[PDB]
Design an enzyme around this catalytic site. Structure first.
Site, mmCIF file in Angstrom:
data_model
loop_
_atom_site.group_PDB
_atom_site.id
_atom_site.type_symbol
_atom_site.label_atom_id
_atom_site.label_comp_id
_atom_site.label_asym_id
_atom_site.label_seq_id
_atom_site.Cartn_x
_atom_site.Cartn_y
_atom_site.Cartn_z
ATOM 1 N N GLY A 1 0.815 -1.199 0.000
ATOM 2 C CA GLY A 1 0.000 0.000 0.000
ATOM 3 C C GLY A 1 0.851 1.251 0.000
ATOM 4 O O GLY A 1 1.938 1.269 -0.592
ATOM 5 N N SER B 1 5.171 -6.239 -2.039
ATOM 6 C CA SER B 1 5.535 -4.823 -2.068
ATOM 7 C C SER B 1 5.975 -4.283 -0.716
ATOM 8 O O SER B 1 7.015 -4.687 -0.199
ATOM 9 C CB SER B 1 4.386 -3.998 -2.616
ATOM 10 N N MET B 2 5.170 -3.397 -0.126
ATOM 11 C CA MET B 2 5.498 -2.808 1.168
ATOM 12 C C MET B 2 5.413 -3.892 2.228
ATOM 13 O O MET B 2 6.295 -3.995 3.075
ATOM 14 C CB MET B 2 4.560 -1.627 1.487
ATOM 15 N N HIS C 1 8.891 -5.827 -5.232
ATOM 16 C CA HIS C 1 8.825 -5.043 -6.433
ATOM 17 C C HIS C 1 9.267 -3.618 -6.143
ATOM 18 O O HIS C 1 9.617 -3.304 -5.009
ATOM 19 C CB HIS C 1 7.397 -5.130 -7.027
ATOM 20 N N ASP D 1 8.043 -7.068 -10.760
ATOM 21 C CA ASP D 1 7.636 -8.018 -9.707
ATOM 22 C C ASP D 1 8.463 -9.313 -9.628
ATOM 23 O O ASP D 1 8.893 -9.857 -10.640
ATOM 24 C CB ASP D 1 6.142 -8.375 -9.833
#
Lengths: 183, 183, 183, 183, 183, 183, 183, 183, 183, 183, 183
Positions: E58, E87-88, E112, E161
């Site tokens: 996010g 991600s995060m 990513h 990714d």
């Protein structure tokens, strides 16, 4: 607001063998250009055809219907980029008769790999995935064909969007010359 | 509409080591399930836990978070299916403690393969496609494991939607027996 | 505007062994009924449970999680229809313990075959249509079982919506007697 | 906006055996009313219950479940109309314990035949149009009963919407008297 | 429906020093986590805090508010990935205390690069472009730091990714071990 | 999913003098902060208060409510940027008591000029334009004041967006120092 | 409502070598202008062409397709601004044949730097940022060319929106003189 | 419904040098008017053109394209108002050739200052506000000129909408007289 | 599915000096009517014109364009009401040449006072309310003039919607006679 | 904007016996193509007819209108694919006169089984599932007929989407050859 | 993107007495067919007319306006089904001149009972139900007449959707023969 009704400006220029490719490439506008190229070849299979291009790209299949038409008809299709020719727009511009592909002084070219998406069962997902990759390969090869670049330089240059000024498009081999001729 | 405010009917059942998986599986409804599991465990590491299942499936990533929790904790997680246990619902159903997986006389079980989708450049399309295929494989391995069916058997059987009656889920090895016990 | 608070009218009534089946049968409201029954069995396996029904039907699989629960628990489950009991509602009503199924003077009962629907490849359409025909048979049987009617009569009678008054539901065998008790 | 809390205004009035029917009669609101009535009886089988009605009417089966409950419990249910008693609202008002049915000075009562609708194959349309025809008769039978009006007179009077002032209502037999007691 | 109440399940586990990070990371859910962390440092600055992670990522700045808190507070914050961590979310998982970063057997991890965007004057576009770039270097250095991987290895690997299984994460050095600890 | 209850997570921390400013600043969230500041001062005029900021900015008028309350109460208000302090958020960060304004290691600060807009008669357009210009100057004067920068500097530096890392902010005088104290 | 059915009013003015640029510049309208210009060049290569401009600006690529055509055709293209000529409209106004660029007495002209916006990966953001910046430079260069202004002057003057009355436009060099010829 | 097909009633009247300004003024309809006037000038430079006006006003830049054309062409443009001429419409009415401006007996006129708006950074707000103020002065100056009113007088009178009857508009100098000529 | 094309039914009737005002009066439909009248007058300054009216009325300024024109042109304009002539529609009818205003047998006429509505500041609300009162006065005097009633009478008569049959309309002086001539 | 208006490019080609099938097949574009074929036949029964196809597929029934017409007329209908021929598009391509089916070098072909869906009583679902299966059979047979593959081979190949390049379609017996004929 | 302009393909075919019926039946498309029939009859009351049918059905009342016109005019109307003829489509196909009703080989035919649905008072609902029934009886009577089936047979066959292949349609008596005539 209307196709200049002096007899319709576009019909007026078609008799001068001029065809415009503008905006999003898609089935119907693509079909319209195929019809025009067919009628001009009918009028005379020896005289060149001038195809103007200002496009952000669009549907590949539709672009290929135009592409194959160009290669198949007898007259040479000279391509002229005004404004821009991006993705499928850039492909069709380099598809013109070698020696007859031009860029205007301030036009911009942009090339990239194919985009797509599918939703469904994994099995189906693999089939549609294998497909887009084949299409990418075919496209990458055709680009290397018309530009003179290797398959590798092309694959490398199309991974993420790549912009070209008019001169850079010439050095690149995308186009042959720049049309300036002022007055 | 909300909890049967006697405490909350569901809360009343948690003290009897009873837990419910209802509706679409997804991150939040899942985390909720995980919480009750670690909780019931901290309260008593040896008594059985009973997880009732009535689900059509949901987010695989969300379901595996439950899966791994079931596996990791000491108490045997007994699985019971009422209504239905389809897709990831059928996965968690057979992932219960061996010999402690049950089906109700008229519950409907169903199995299939992973569902998914994606949009973007073909280079990223390949990445995500390859990813779901790995998930398909892992899952297939896990199903074979809990059911005792050869890996290929599982593969053949989950290519297209497959339904099993209670008597059939048992012969297939998805659950150990049928809770009939009338009255 | 909200649940009446003597201590929550519903929990307060649950202590009297009373459960309500109201409106659309669906997973979550089906689940709430299941926990309650479970609870009332744990409280007292010997005493009758009372299930009021006023519903137009719903998701079959959800209703089946309830059907199986009734059959499975120790205490007999008596059923009382108020307002109406149509489709899955009528079924759950006739599924009450023999001799303990009632209709209030002006209740309205309705029976019919299942409704369903699919979209996809024909191979898949065929898989799903097959499942749905199985369920219809299961339902025809269970219903012939509880009503004491013949399987054919049931089918014949459920091809198209059939409405029954309280005195007709008693004759058809769907319900044991009619509670009236004025005052 | 929110409920006034001395201990929840309504609950507070519930212990005093007072119950409210406000707005659209629909299933869930109706069940809540049934619940309260069963509770009061369970608390005292002999003392009267007070049912205030301010409603434009609503779903007939939803209201019929309330009706059967009224006639069913030992304690008489006294009805009082405030604001309006339209359709099913007027029906349940006239259904209270003979002698304990009241209208407030400026109340407004309105009676009319059932409304409904269908969509489907003509065989189906027929089955439903016949069902609503049955309910219309049943409703008229019950209204003639409570008001002491002849069924034929009821029928005639209900074809089109009919408005009744509190006095006109007492004269028609829908209500026993006007509640006044000032100071 | 409600958080399971045996005194609010999440609160109960909170006292056992357990915090949940679920779904999208955004400001307020981040604030909630920072608060529970500060609360536990306060409660006992020596014991371990357990942060479970099941998230797709996010807002970065919001993830960073969680990152810098973990680092600052006295107690060691152990991270356990369940479900997913992309991600995060993956960044935060690897941010945990060394030797105390766990992965469940079937958890899926995905790393990513930063996504973003702007609309405005070119001068303004330059400014926001330059910023997002710096946040990229910053995030790569930090991941390099936590995994032991080199900066470049991190750059290369995150440009598009990259999914990793539990054993693969344990070998990339995102997580230290896998919690199989069966039953 | 809910405010964690050790006795409301945020209350629990309020009692230890911590207050959070999260998200877009707007009247109501601003009102909540003012109320908390008043409360604490009223509890002990000599103990410092801690205001954690993580906001993109927001309505100027509303942030100024917090700003004026900060300067008025007796306790020093220590500001801590976590995540980001953009626009009015950075403003309020630098407004903390000199020597007690802090940036966490990876905090992102951003300063800029105000935004606004009107629709209407030119006369009113003049009035409203003039007003935001006044607010611009006032905001510049004050920022200069808290940072030590010349007004001309602040003006220069804020016509277009400006980003700062914790260390650049320190350098800038927007904040005093960076909080790192690990474990 | 519709055009002037006296054989289309505009075709009529086209036969007097007059072309109208009205409203937002975009691919299709711009293509229509290119058609008319070629048609006119065909009709006669040395007679002047008059482009009336009343535009707020628009898509740069579409406008540049117009720019290059004006320069390429042999005929001199006199441009006349009536109403407004903002951003690209103004850019095309100045682009007229030196000595033949006019402004009606009350027309307003406005110049500014390019606007734009992308969404995506940071790697793609830098690429689109580099391109947009390149576009700005080329654009200031060309404007300095037709105005006789220095490149740093224009860069300075287009950073933020700049308006100009006819006299100021003439004295600035964007247009040669003001047209009035009353009667 | 359609343009009266007697060769279009409008085209027809155009040959009687009759043009119609109707509805809201904006670029395209404004362009249609400019075109008509130019054609008529060409058709005969010494004959009068009659421009009817029934408009609530609209976009200023667009109305000004018309205004500047009226002054330019050699033929006098007689203005006639029917229905109404508000804001820009009235402006254009008073701009007709001196001695040649009219109102029908029941036409209504209304004058007022310019309307506008903006959203953005304060620096820009000032630039945009400064410009609408300039256009207003310019507008007040041309109005004073055509009415014979004093600048200060127009200024005052246009601060808020000011309505004028035909008789009043002649007296205010907005128009020359009133067409009545019955039969 | 279009105007009947025997030469466009309406154009053809225009040759017989027939014009139709159908439905809602609005600026554009009104303009079309004006153009027709000016055309006819021009073709033959002497013969009668026939305006059929079937309208519920519409915008006042729009209908006033028409009224003022009817009185202006030398040719008499006979009016015939078919269907209805309500509000402004009734106005235009009574405004036809004396003796030449007709109503068909089952036509309905409805007369009323102006409707309006404004939003804004009190000073502006007053400028506008005052203007509508003037239009109401002006309208009443005109209706009085055409009908032969007293101004005070029309004022009384038009405060609330007034419906009149064709015979009533003739008595009121709105119309002179009723056309019937059948066979 | 419009089909090139030099007697319409499509009608021009139609006299040259060309007919285009583009985009989704559906009842109406289908009908248009049926009329063109019947027209060409009436013109000349022995001259070949050329049908270009660029379609993603579409409605079966619609497409069979075309198919049945193609076989029925006397003239041979040669089929040519440009762009793509998927599902029903592909099917109609192979339905062309034996020896007269072509692909441009870069066309893509895709074959699959029928898609469909229904919602309703179980009795009608079966009815509808039986029909779709019957259609699948019939089409698989016709597919074998035209391509020369076994029925079993078609079935095995249409179960899941199957793409084919131009040469691959040639070897599959779907099309006779590829057109390339340059110059 | 416009009807085939070789004199409009449909009118071209209309001179050949070919009329097309495509898509849903409704008042306007039906009025169109009736008009084409009247016209053709005008021309020659002896010759045959050909009605091509490709329809899913539609509005019964619209269909019967077509049906009655077919029986009424002097010429024979031969019906040819292509694609499909379901419900009202199928009814009109069997209505052609006995011995002149054909199916193309792969035509799919569908027969079923009328569909409908009312909303409102029970009294009206009955008026409307009795009406849909009379229409159903009439449609079945006419269906028997044309096909040669017994009334009772048609009823049995139309109680639920019944599909027919071209051969079965012939065998059923709906159509006379199949058309195949190749080349």
């Amino acid at each position: 607001s209307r196709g200049e009704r002096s007899f319709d400006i576009y019909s007026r220029l078609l008799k001068e063998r001029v065809i415009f490719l503008t905006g999003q490439v898609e089935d119907h506008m693509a079909n319209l250009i195929v019809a025009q190229m067919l009628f001009l070849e009918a009028e005379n299979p020896e005289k060149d055809i001038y195809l103007y291009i200002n496009s952000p790209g669009g549907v590949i299949t539709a672009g290929m219907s135009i592409y194959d038409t160009m290669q198949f008809i007898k007259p040479d299709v000279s391509t002229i980029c005004m404004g821009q020719a991006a993705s499928m727009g850039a492909f069709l511009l380099t598809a013109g008769a070698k020696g007859k592909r031009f860029c205007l002084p301030n036009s911009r070219v942009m090339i990239h790999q194919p985009l797509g998406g599918y939703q469904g069962q994994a099995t189906d997902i693999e089939i549609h995935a294998r497909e887009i990759l084949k299409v990418k390969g075919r496209m990458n090869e055709l680009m290397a064909l018309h530009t003179g670049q290797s398959l590798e330089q092309i694959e490398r240059d199309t991974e993420r969007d790549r912009f070209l000024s008019a001169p850079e498009a010439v050095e690149y081999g995308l186009v042959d010359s720049i049309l300036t001729h002022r007055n």
